[PDB]
Structure formats: structure tokens, C-alpha cells
Design a protein around this ligand. Structure first.
Ligand SMILES: Nc1nc2c(c(=O)[nH]1)N[C@H]1C(S)=C(S)[C@@H](COP(=O)(O)OP(=O)(O)OC[C@H]3O[C@@H](n4cnc5c(=O)[nH]c(N)nc54)[C@H](O)[C@@H]3O)O[C@H]1N2
Ligand SMILES: Nc1nc2c(c(=O)[nH]1)N[C@H]1[C@@H](S)[C@H](S)[C@@H](COP(=O)(O)OP(=O)(O)OC[C@H]3O[C@@H](n4cnc5c(=O)[nH]c(N)nc54)[C@H](O)[C@@H]3O)O[C@H]1N2
Ligand code: SF4
Ligand code: SF4
Ligand code: SF4
Ligand code: SF4
Ligand SMILES: [Ca+2]
Ligand SMILES: [W+6]
Lengths: 977, 214
């Protein structure tokens, strides 16, 4: 009409939400005069969200345009009770000096055992899935050049179990399908997840499946916003999931609901297991009761003359995996599951019947699960059980199927891909250790061998990736010399979040980077984690807002005069003020652009890293100390433009990789300087760089695939929503991994109405998705390959002998208290767990009678630093709360909204009571077990009456006193305040 | 003229609409505390035009959680305006092209604001503290006359919010009600003949909000 839009003359750019891993597109409008955002909303054209956003994405404008962002760097001197503003130059040069001096003082060339390790033991780093891919990569590169081995972030806590379990089963740790693909599911099982709150836009697709006739199932100890939409909601006791899942396996096998052809073709069901395998009363064969470890060699497969596992494809051999499974699972009858899970038998059966109906070749069931328990001795086998069930039902590699292991942060996929974890370099390459002295030994160790020519065994390519990674960092060094620049971890020593904070507490860590994380709220046992920070000589904290970590020295019960720690707080840019990429849960690598400029005077992470690295290089170039080479030889020129600034296009091209010298591979010729087109062309001889081999193909001579916005689809692609022209997914744009298993041996789809790939015999090519493995169909004995190309034989593992606690999942009670016996064996708790009382009866303190769990709400993010500082979100969820049943509330004389005190042996906090019918006590063996729940989104720094960290109450996953939180279950009392 | 169809059976209470409305209009957050519920703020106020109401309800022995993303209904024959018109016909605009009922700042000059608020069967309009000025949902009038949909509708991920010509929305509402009437024998549309924002509920409207229907 007449009305003008606030945005008419604004600069319009695109971005991608910086909160969860759904990857929603944004449109940003920036005032050309002020360079500030005037509007931020959804991108209607983005195929995943179609312009929709949950509370969090919708609030983005408030994240950027925020007066609580410290405008200038802040320095806290030893013993001081206040921040002091300092110039960027002072801060950057000072940090550079601290890094150089502390590195030198704690650097080990040769360790006490006489091994060359070239490792810095006194500096550690956490962070961060919040950074762009190009920032994550240069960050790990910088840290490794410094000799750091303590390099961790988010992914260690919630996705390490997933990686371990799924890599065992399928060959990779990633989410197998993608968000839009959920619409193709016939049955969606959400278990150990709450996607309507934690991955909200996923519900667009989940509800689209429901519109098509899909059955939605939620299995969760609480009824949540997700539950409201489900056909079946099943409550089950915390940590009892394995019983529920193994009972499903029994049901699948006994009722013959499995998809036989798929099982024979694509799983290890036919493998003959050796005579050493056995299982008796909860223990697999090979158990050493003094070490509490298993001798896994007892579980190996029987091999033929060529060294390949023998197979009985009839699945009848008494030692074939299939028959071993039949025997193993017989104990998981329904009565037992109902008793131990607390779930009515009738309801379990409803879930089993509904879900197991997807074992038909043309049907697909999916499982959405996210964090699960953080203890691997609970989590890993639970995910394995899910993975097994999916293989038996032929659900892996098909449209609407998969293990949709939902990623957490917007770029946790990327920060994991880029090796911000102690045990892997970018591209999932194992990190060097003291007992691996030479590059030749390193490649020999990590390159698997199969003599079976029908098995792709794709990791045989390892040396191409290790050379390319090493060259991307030290391109002018030869590989043997450059390998020696990589710091080597002490043999058998854990450098993860698990022990990083314990070591910091013990005084071993002098300098610490808290880069884009808030461990004072996110680490287990906040009281002790906060005290651990006081042992540091210095900390560099890079974040959007002042926070519980950077200002730990002025937190609860702290006397600043007694805290010696020097703190450097560096205010950073927010996502819409940055250009780079982030990779979503579906592995979609998405390019984002600058809308508003970095709010004065914040600096984006990439530039902060560039500035620190260059300054430290110049100090070491003048004064080399013990070992300057890895530091000074690092090719930081690859990271910057001609003006010395962070260049995301340059870094993304390095991550993809390019030729360092002319070479030829097959029929393809490369000239020095050219981008490599696919990881299949990378070179073992040092001829190529590639910061992360899984990204080779993302940014080639044909351009930036991650910046593509092409919605063109073939009819086939459109039927299932692949959108292969929209951005780019690793590996090589295969949107549904394991897709060779969606077709028969001839290459014909099992589900013609929602086919993923199909072999075109006349053209000798696969159409639809990019085939996960491009070779001819498996029926082609001469040229074809098996479906699971990352596995050594090409078969997914039902029976998975690599897991430290057993080749098949087995139920054990996850908690000591209260004491609950289970009916599956005489082995009460996981025999590989070390934190349990064994010889004595557990001694359960009546002071802490209730189980407390921590979880999220839709409106807040992580420790809440970001969303507590976002008024619109804080308005919706302004305070720490405690959800409890009517029964418990009555027992404790609590009324709705009362302030209550939660206390555990570790500490205590207040919360506002939310009495809800959505939680009910669990009844197990004559016992009424009460579980209450709290969010972990609050912290003392803001707002004044918001509350503090749930982790004040938590212990670690193990014997550690700090570290990885067992976030799902811990003992407390709840009392009216 | 325009309308909305709000299908509460598809709402996940993601609160995208609540935030989106504020983001588009520049509305500030208002003071809240947690008093035992996830819903917040507790009610409409001068700065909050879209409010996701949330109510636990035991239905047929099973717990459920009912959501209602409340906003002005844009009444076809708006009683708020009818009342205000006795004082000043320019205080509340009734836009012919869209059907939008637009509270303007001219409301500040109304001597009798209480009568305007009480005339609303849905208890929607709200006064700012310092004067008689009142505000509420403006149907995103600027967006809808400039080729865009309302902020709340655009933001909604599950298709709970829908916007278009009134007739199309009326037809959509009726068809959707028909699709669930069997399973949800108490489902109904809320005053479908009298308002432009039409809510579908699966149970007694008053289980969603005391003022769900007139
Ligand atoms: N809105 C929002 N979304 C987020 C985040 C956020 O902070 N806020 N964080 C992101 C991150 S980093 C991650 S890793 C993911 C985590 O995503 P989720 O794992 O979905 O997160 P939670 O909310 O912690 O737990 C999910 C559900 O597990 C239930 N639960 C607890 N114990 C058990 C159990 O023993 N068995 C079963 N079956 N269920 C159980 C809880 O009741 C809860 O409903 O979310 C991401 N998304
Ligand atoms: N009891 C309990 N404990 C748990 C969990 C639980 O469920 N229960 N969850 C665990 C997991 S799954 C997660 S991933 C982990 C997250 O902790 P953290 O990263 O410190 O949180 P965060 O600091 O709040 O969020 C990430 C940070 O990113 C910043 N950020 C965002 N964008 C940027 C950027 O561009 N650059 C930089 N440098 N930083 C940025 C945020 O401000 C935030 O601090 O907390 C575990 N702990
Ligand atoms: S938080 Fe997740 S679902 Fe919500 S708008 Fe951002 S990416 Fe989308
Ligand atoms: S719902 Fe109330 S405020 Fe909105 S048009 Fe109708 S009478 Fe007026
Ligand atoms: S139509 Fe516009 S003003 Fe009304 S509730 Fe939705 S976003 Fe707010
Ligand atoms: S945006 Fe849609 S699903 Fe989210 S709260 Fe609003 S109406 Fe409900
Ligand atoms: Ca199937
Ligand atoms: W996480």
C-alpha cells in the first residue's frame, strides 16, 4: 500500500543459524550507513527450513545487536578484583609472550623414556564447535605447531560414544541420512532425543512424514514438547534403554522380521566367529578380573587361506554371527524388559510391532538420538544396539532410514572433522604417540589391509591423507622431518576433557585457552572445575560475552586476592558478522557471509588466530629455544590475503587441497597450484596438500560448492529431497551414506518409490544420490564392491569385536544407587567400568535419595551464555527450574513455583519448582524411584536472579573428580527453600 | 481480505512465532520470573502481541500438553473499534484491503480505554504503563502489503501458522477439522464465523485458554 518496509534500502546477505545442527538458512539486512543489522529472519528459499526458525534462530538480531558484548579486550592481573581495558596490540603481543615463554618452560623434546615427542605439556585448549570450519582448521594447525596435545572441544562430551559405536557398525561416526530425508520415513523412533525442542526445524520434516502416514514414537523418561506429536509415547527408567533395545533385537530375530537378503548381502551375519568366543553370566570370554579389561582376541573371526573371515551365507553355522545373536538375545523377553524399564509390556509391544514393520524392503524406519549418556560404558552399547536393529531391518542406506545421530552445535560436525580432539588430526587421522617414532611406522600402523578384492577397504588410502595433511601445514619440509614436528602423546596417556581438568587441578597445566567454550559451567563438578582454573598461570578466553569462565576469579566463593591467574578476555565477532563455512548434522557444508561488520571493537576468531600465530612465529624466529622449527615453519601464509588478514577462501581451498607439484593420477593431470577435485586424487608422496581429506571436492577448480544455492533436482532426487545442488555435503556430496545398501546385488532399488541410487547399466553409472562407492553393483564379482566401503571387508558389523565392552550389547545397571538388580545375568554393572563398588555392597547415602537429570529447553543454548544474554529468550525462560512429579512434590511439601534447594555431595543450588504430570516416579522391584530434572542453561554471571550451573551438582563419568559430566543421572536431595 | 488458520495440533511450542513477532516489530522483552510454568510472559502486554500459551491437561487418563499461540483475532466486526469509535474513529483503524484491525498511537488520546479493553471477547488489547496508549498484533500490516507474509507465519516450522485470503483460510480450517473430527470428537474451530484468525483445537477450547472462544 503506502507503508515502507524497515528493510527497503538495506544490504541483504545470507547466513546459517549459529545455534543447533539443523542448518537453517537466514536472511540478514544491514543498514549501509551504520553497518549494523536492522533485521534477521529466515531464508524462505533454503530447502531445510523454508524460512522457518525456532525461538533461537528468530532471536538472532538480539545476539549481534547487543550492548552486553564487551567492546574492548579486558585484562585481569594476578590477584586483581576488576577487569582493565587494554588495546588489541598490548593484548596480542602479551599473549604471544606468555605462549612463547610457557611453551618453552614446559616443552619436552625427549621424554624420560628416551622417546622424541616434541610436545608442550603445559598449555591446553578447549574450543570450539562455535567456530567456522576455516577457523577450526587453522586453530588446530596453530596449536599443533606449538606442540599442544591437550586439544579438545564440545564433541568429546556428547558425540564420542556415537563416533565409536557407529564407526564400529558402519565405518563412519556421522549422521547417516539428513534432515529433509526424515519426511521419507515410515516410522520415526525418537529415543534419547527431544527433537521438537533441541532440533526444532526437524519437526517440519517429521510432521511431513506423519502427514504421509508415518508413526511417530518417543521413548523418554519425561513427556516433552516432542511427545505431544507422537502416536506412541513410552516412558522408561533412566539408563534402561539397552534392555528396551535388546528386547527389540530378540523380537526381530525370533519373529523373523529382519530383511534376510539385506542381512546376508550387507552385514557380517554370515561371518564365522572363532571358537574362543563365549558369553557366560554377563561376561564375554577373555575377561581379566584384575585389570577389568577384556582380551578381545578371544572374539575374532575364523579366517580362510587368504586371511578373510569365513562366511556361511545360509546363516545356519552354529558360530556364524547370526546364530550367536539368536542365542545371545534369547534372554530379553518382554516381561523382563517391562520390569527393568518400568514400561508397560503392552506399550513395549506396540512400539516393537510398529517399528519392526519397517523390515520390509520398501519400508524405512529411522532412529533420532542425540546425546545419550555420557558414560561410554552405558552409551556406546546402547547406540550399538540401535545400529544392530537398523541393520537387521534393512534401514541403513535407504531413504527415510538410518541412524540419525543428531549433532549438537551448528558446527560440531566441522570442529570434529577438523580434529579439535586429542586423539585425531583433521580427517579422522589418529594422532602421533611416543611409540611411533617415524612416519613410515605411523602410516603402517594406520593403514588397514584386506586381501579381499571385492572389498573397497577405503582406508587403505590413509597415507594419501596423512601426507596431504602434513604438507598442508609444513609444505616445504619433507614428510619424515615434518612428521617429527607433530607432538607425540605419552603412550597410554589420556589428554581428553576426561583428564585435562584433573591435570589442571593437579597443577600440570600452566596456560589455557578457553576458546569459545564455558567450562566453568559445562564441565562436570563446577565447584571443582572453577577451583581448577585458579591453578593456571594464565588463561586466554575468547568469547562474545563476559562469562563464568573468563570471570571465574570473581565467581561464587572466590577471593580474587588469592587467585594468581592472569586472564586475557578477547571479545569476538558473532556468526552474522563472519564469512566462512559450517557443516550441519547432515554433513552439509554451508557458506555464510558477513552482514553487519564485527561490532566495534570485536575481532572474528580467524583473525585473532592469525594475529597470535604470526606474533608467536616472529618471537621464535628471533629466539628459537629448544625447538623452533614446527612453530616457524608452519605455513601461515596459506591462511592470509596479501594484506596479512584471515582469508576464508584461501583456507577453504587448503582444506580442500591443491597440487604442490605437477603430477598425474589415472587419466587426470594436475599442475602445481590447482585445486584437487576429489580425495580420490590425493597423493601419498607429498605432491598434494589437503587440510582435511573428507572435504576434497568442496572447493575445486570449478568453485566453492558450499556457496551453491541450486535447487535443481532430477525427478528421482526430488522424490526424496536430496537437493544435491544446495551447498555441498561430505564425502563427495553423498547425501545419504551407505546408499549402496539401498539396492540389491544388481543395483536395483529395494524401495522404487523412494530410491536413493540406481545403477544405469547402459551408462555404467549410478543415478540419484552420489553413490557411496562408485564401483559397479556387488553382483559384479570382478569389478563391483561391497556396500560398507569404510569397513575392512565391506560388510556392516552386527557383531563388532572392536568395542572394549563386548562384540554385542548387553544390559548392565547404569547406576549404583539406589540398588536395583537386573534379571539378565549375575553381572550387575558393566565389567569394564572401574568406578563401581564391587567387593562391597554399594553404600547409598539417604541424604541424596533422588535421581536428578539435566537436559535442555527450546529457548536456551548450552550453558546459556548466549541466550541468557538475549532478552527475548531470557523473557521466555528467565530462571533455573526443577521439574518434578506431583508425587515427589507432595512428599517434600513443595508447591508449584516454590524456590527449592537441590544438593548433592558436590554442591548445592536453587531452582524454581515446576510440578508436572509429565514426570512420574518409576516403580522397580517394590521400590518407588524418583527422578527430577533441571536445565543446565544458567550461570551466576547473568542475569542477577537467573541461577547458576546445574554442573555444581554433577560428578564426572568416572574416577576423575572433574571432566566429562555424567549429565543424565546423579543423586541429590530436593528441599523447599 | 485476509485471514489465518492456526492449527494448534501442529504447534510444538518452539516459540519461533513469539520471538519473531518481537524481532519484526522491535518489541522489547518484558519482566518475567518462573512461577512453575514454561509459558512466559504470563499474558499479553503492551509489548507482546504473540504469546504461546501452554497448558498441561490430562485427557482420557493420559497427560497431554496443549499449546495456543495467542494473538488478536482480527474480528470481522471488531468490538474494540466499535467502542473506541464512540470517542475517536481514528484511534483504531479497520483496514478494508486486509481486514486488519490496527490500534494506532492515537489510542493515547482515548479518555475511556477500559471500555475498549473490556469490549474484546478475547481479552487481547494492552495499555502501556505511562499513558492510555494501547497496542496488539497489527497483522504485520507492513509485510502483508509489501509482498511478504506475517513474521509469525513465516517463522513457524510445522505449518501450524497459515496465512492467506480469508476464504482460503476458512476452507483450510474446515477441511483440517474434518480430518481429525473422528479421532478428536471434541475438536472444533474457535468462532469460525466471527474472526479472521481461526484456531483449530482438538479438545474443549477452554483447556487451551480461558478466552480461546468468545
Ligand atoms: N534448544 C537447544 N537445543 C540444543 C541444545 C541446547 O542447549 N538447547 N544443545 C545442543 C547440543 S550441544 C546437543 S549434544 C544436543 C543434545 O540433544 P538431546 O540429547 O536431545 O538433549 P537433552 O535435552 O539433553 O536430552 C534429550 C532427552 O533425553 C531424555 N533422557 C534422559 N535420560 C534418558 C535415558 O536414559 N534414556 C532415554 N531414552 N532418554 C533420556 C531427557 O528426558 C530428554 O528429553 O542438543 C543440541 N540442541
Ligand atoms: N550437566 C550437563 N553438562 C553438559 C551438558 C548437559 O547436557 N548436562 N551438555 C554437554 C554438551 S553436549 C555440550 S556440547 C557442552 C557445551 O559446553 P560449552 O561449549 O562450554 O558451552 P557454551 O560455552 O555455553 O557454548 C559454546 C560457546 O560458543 C560461544 N560462541 C558462539 N559463537 C562464537 C564465535 O564465533 N566465536 C567464539 N570464540 N565463541 C563463540 C558462545 O558464546 C558459547 O560460550 O556442555 C556439556 N555439558
Ligand atoms: S536453533 Fe536449530 S532449528 Fe532453531 S533456527 Fe537455529 S538451526 Fe534452525
Ligand atoms: S480480538 Fe479483541 S482486540 Fe483483536 S479485533 Fe477482536 S475485539 Fe479487537
Ligand atoms: S501477524 Fe504479525 S503482529 Fe500479529 S502476531 Fe503474527 S508476527 Fe505478531
Ligand atoms: S512458530 Fe509454529 S510451532 Fe512454533 S510455537 Fe509458533 S505456532 Fe507453534
Ligand atoms: Ca527396511
Ligand atoms: W553437544
Amino acid at each position: 500500500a503506502t507503508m515502507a518496509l524497515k528493510t527497503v534500502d538495506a544490504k541483504q546477505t545470507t547466513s546459517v543459524c549459529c545455534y543447533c545442527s539443523v542448518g537453517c538458512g537466514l536472511i540478514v539486512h544491514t543498514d549501509k550507513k551504520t553497518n549494523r543489522a536492522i533485521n534477521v529472519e529466515g531464508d524462505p528459499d533454503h530447502p531445510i527450513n523454508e524460512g522457518s526458525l525456532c525461538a533461537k534462530g528468530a532471536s538472532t538480531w538480539q545476539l549481534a545487536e547487543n550492548e552486553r558484548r564487551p567492546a574492548n579486550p579486558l585484562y585481569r592481573a594476578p590477584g586483581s578484583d576488576q577487569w582493565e581495558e587494554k588495546s588489541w596490540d598490548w593484548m596480542l603481543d602479551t599473549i604471544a609472550e606468555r605462549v612463547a615463554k610457557t611453551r618453552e618452560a614446559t616443552f619436552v623434546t625427549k621424554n624420560a623414556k628416551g622417546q622424541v615427542v616434541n610436545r608442550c605439556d603445559g598449555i591446553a585448549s578447549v574450543g570450539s564447535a562455535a567456530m567456522d570450519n576455516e577457523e577450526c582448521w587453522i586453530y588446530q594447525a596453530w596449536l599443533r605447531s606449538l606442540g599442544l596435545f591437550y586439544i579438545e572441544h564440545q564433541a568429546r562430551i556428547x558425540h564420542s560414544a556415537t563416533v565409536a559405536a557407529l564407526a564400529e557398525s558402519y565405518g563412519r561416526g556421522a549422521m547417516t541420512n539428513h534432515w529433509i530425508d526424515l519426511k521419507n520415513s515410515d516410522v520415526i523412533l525418537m529415543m534419547g532425543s527431544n527433537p521438537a525442542e533441541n532440533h526444532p526445524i526437524s519437526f517440519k520434516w517429521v510432521m511431513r512424514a506423519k502427514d504421509k502416514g508415518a508413526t511417530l514414537i518417543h521413548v523418554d523418561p519425561r513427556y516433552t514438547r516432542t511427545s505431544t506429536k507422537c502416536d506412541l509415547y513410552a516412558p522408561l527408567r533412566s539408563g534402561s534403554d539397552i534392555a528396551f533395545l535388546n528386547g527389540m533385537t530378540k523380537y526381530i530375530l525370533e519373529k523373523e522380521l529382519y530383511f534376510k537378503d539385506y542381512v546376508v548381502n550387507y552385514t557380517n551375519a554370515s561371518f564365522i566367529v572363532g571358537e574362543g568366543f563365549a558369553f557366560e553370566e554377563g561376561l564375554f570370554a577373555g575377561y581379566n578380573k584384575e585389570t577389568r579389561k577384556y582380551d578381545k582376541s578371544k572374539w575374532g573371526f575364523e579366517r580362510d587361506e587368504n586371511g578373510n573371515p569365513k562366511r556361511d551365507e545360509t546363516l545356519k553355522h552354529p558360530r556364524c554371527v547370526f546364530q550367536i545373536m539368536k542365542k545371545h538375545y534369547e534372554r530379553y523377553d518382554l516381561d523382563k524388559i517391562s520390569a527393568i524399564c518400568g514400561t508397560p509390556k503392552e506399550l513395549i509391544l506396540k512400539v516393537y510391532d510398529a517399528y519392526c514393520a519397517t523390515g520390509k524392503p520398501d519400508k524405512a524406519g529411522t532412529i533420532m538420538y542425540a546425546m545419550g549418556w555420557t558414560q561410554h560404558t552405558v552409551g556406546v552399547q546402547n547406540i550399538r544396539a540401535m545400529s544392530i536393529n537398523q541393520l537387521l531391518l534393512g534401514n541403513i542406506g535407504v531413504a527415510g532410514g538410518g541412524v540419525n545421530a543428531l549433532r549438537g552445535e551448528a558446527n560440531v560436525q566441522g570442529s570434529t572433522d577438523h580434529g579439535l580432539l586429542m586423539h585425531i588430526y583433521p580427517g579422522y587421522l589418529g594422532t602421533a604417540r611416543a611409540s611411533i617414532p617415524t612416519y613410515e611406522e605411523y602410516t603402517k600402523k594406520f593403514t588397514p589391509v584386506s586381501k579381499d578384492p571385492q572389498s573397497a577397504n577405503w582406508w587403505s588410502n590413509f597415507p594419501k591423507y596423512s601426507a596431504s595433511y602434513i604438507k598442508s601445514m609444513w609444505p616445504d619440509a619433507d614428510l619424515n622431518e615434518a612428521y617429527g614436528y607433530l607432538p607425540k602423546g605419552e603412550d597410554g596417556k589420556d589428554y581428553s576433557w576426561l583428564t585435562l581438568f584433573d591435570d589442571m587441578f593437579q597443577g600440570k597445566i600452566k596456560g589455557f585457552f578457553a576458546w569459545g567454550q564455558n567450562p566453568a559451567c559445562s564441565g562436570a563438578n563446577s565447584n571443582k572445575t572453577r577451583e581448577a582454573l585458579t591453578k593456571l598461570d594464565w588463561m586466554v578466553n575468547v568469547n562474545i560475552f563476559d562469562n563464568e569462565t573468563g570471570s571465574f576469579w570473581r565467581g561464587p566463593d572466590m577471593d580474587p586476592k588469592k587467585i594468581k591467574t592472569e586472564v586475557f578476555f578477547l571479545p569476538c565477532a558473532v556468526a552474522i558478522e563472519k564469512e566462512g563455512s559450517i557443516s550441519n548434522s547432515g554433513r552439509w557444508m554451508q557458506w555464510r557471509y558477513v552482514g553487519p561488520e564485527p561490532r566495534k571493537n570485536a575481532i572474528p576468531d580467524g583473525d585473532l588466530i592469525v594475529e597470535l600465530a604470526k606474533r608467536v612465529q616472529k618471537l621464535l624466529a628471533k629466539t628459537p629455544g629448544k625447538l623452533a622449527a614446527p612453530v616457524t615453519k608452519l605455513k601461515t601464509d596459506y591462511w592470509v590475503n596479501d594484506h596479512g588478514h584471515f582469508d576464508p577462501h584461501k583456507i577453504a581451498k587448503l582444506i580442500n587441497g591443491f597440487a604442490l607439484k605437477d603430477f598425474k593420477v589415472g587419466d587426470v593431470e594436475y599442475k602445481a597450484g590447482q585445486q584437487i577435485a576429489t580425495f580420490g586424487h590425493l597423493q601419498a608422496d607429498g605432491s598434494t596438500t589437503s587440510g582435511c581429506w573428507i572435504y576434497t571436492g568442496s572447493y575445486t577448480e570449478k568453485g566453492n560448492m558450499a556457496a551453491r544455492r541450486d535447487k535443481t533436482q532430477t525427478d528421482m532426487q526430488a522424490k526424496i529431497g536430496l537437493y544435491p545442488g544446495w551447498t555441498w555435503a561430505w564425502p563427495v556430496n553423498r547425501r545419504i551414506i551407505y546408499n549402496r545398501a539401498s539396492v540389491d546385488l544388481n543395483g536395483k532399488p529395494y524401495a522404487p518409490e523412494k530410491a536413493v541410487v540406481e545403477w544405469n547399466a547402459a551408462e555404467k553409472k549410478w543415478v540419484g544420490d552420489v553413490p557411496d562407492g562408485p564401483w559397479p553393483p556387488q553382483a559384479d564379482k570382478e569389478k563391483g564392491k561391497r556396500a560398507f566401503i569404510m569397513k575392512p571387508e565391506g560388510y556392516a558389523y552386527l557383531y563388532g569385536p572392536g568395542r572394549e565392552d563386548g562384540p554385542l550389547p548387553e544390559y548392565y545397571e547404569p547406576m549404583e544407587c539406589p540398588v536395583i538388580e537386573h534379571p539378565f545375568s549375575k553381572t550387575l554393572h558393566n565389567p569394564t567400568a572401574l568406578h563401581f563398588a564391587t567387593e562391597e555392597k554399594a553404600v547409598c547415602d539417604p541424604r541424596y535419595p533422588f535421581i536428578c537429570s539435566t537436559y535442555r529447553v527450546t529457548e536456551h543454548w548450552q550453558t546459556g551464555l548466549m541466550t541468557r544474554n538475549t532478552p527475548w529468550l531470557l523473557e521466555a525462560e528467565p530462571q533455573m527450574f526443577c521439574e518434578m512429579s506431583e508425587e515427589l512434590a507432595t512428599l517434600r511439601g513443595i508447591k508449584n513455583g516454590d524456590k527449592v534447594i537441590l544438593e548433592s555431595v558436590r554442591g548445592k543450588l536453587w531452582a524454581k519448582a515446576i510440578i508436572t504430570k509429565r514426570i512420574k516416579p518409576f516403580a522397580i522391584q517394590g521400590q518407588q524411584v524418583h527422578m527430577v530434572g533441571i536445565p543446565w542453561h544458567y550461570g551466576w554471571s547473568f542475569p542477577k536472579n537467573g541461577g547458576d550451573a546445574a554442573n555444581i551438582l554433577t560428578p564426572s563419568v568416572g574416577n576423575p573428580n572433574t571432566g566429562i559430566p555424567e549429565t543424565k543421572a546423579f543423586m541429590v536431595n530436593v528441599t523447599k527453600a | 481480505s485476509k485471514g489465518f488458520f492456526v492449527d494448534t495440533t501442529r504447534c510444538t511450542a518452539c516459540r519461533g512465532c513469539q520471538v519473531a513477532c518481537k524481532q519484526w516489530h522491535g518489541n522489547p522483552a518484558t519482566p518475567t520470573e518462573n512461577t512453575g510454568f514454561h509459558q512466559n510472559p504470563p499474558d499479553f502486554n503492551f509489548h507482546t502481541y504473540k504469546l504461546v500459551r501452554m497448558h498441561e491437561q490430562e485427557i482420557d487418563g493420559r497427560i497431554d500438553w496443549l499449546f495456543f499461540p495467542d494473538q488478536c483475532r482480527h474480528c470481522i466486526a471488531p468490538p474494540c473499534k466499535a467502542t473506541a469509535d464512540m470517542e475517536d474513529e481514528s484511534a483504531i483503524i479497520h483496514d478494508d484491503a486486509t481486514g486488519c484491525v490496527l490500534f494506532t498511537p492515537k489510542t493515547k488520546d482515548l479518555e475511556d480505554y477500559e471500555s475498549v479493553i473490556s469490549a474484546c471477547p478475547y481479552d487481547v488489547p494492552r495499555k502501556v504503563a505511562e499513558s492510555n496508549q494501547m497496542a496488539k498484533c497489527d497483522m504485520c500490516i507492513d509485510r502483508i502489503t509489501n509482498g511478504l507474509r506475517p513474521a509469525c507465519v513465516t517463522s513457524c516450522p510445522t505449518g501450524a501458522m497459515n496465512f492467506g485470503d480469508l476464504s482460503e483460510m476458512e476452507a483450510m480450517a474446515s477441511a483440517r477439522l474434518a480430518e481429525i473430527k473422528a479421532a478428536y470428537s471434541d475438536a472444533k474451530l474457535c468462532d469460525p464465523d466471527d474472526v479472521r484468525v481461526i484456531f483449530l483445537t482438538a479438545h474443549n477450547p477452554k483447556l487451551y485458554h480461558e478466552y480461546a472462544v468468545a
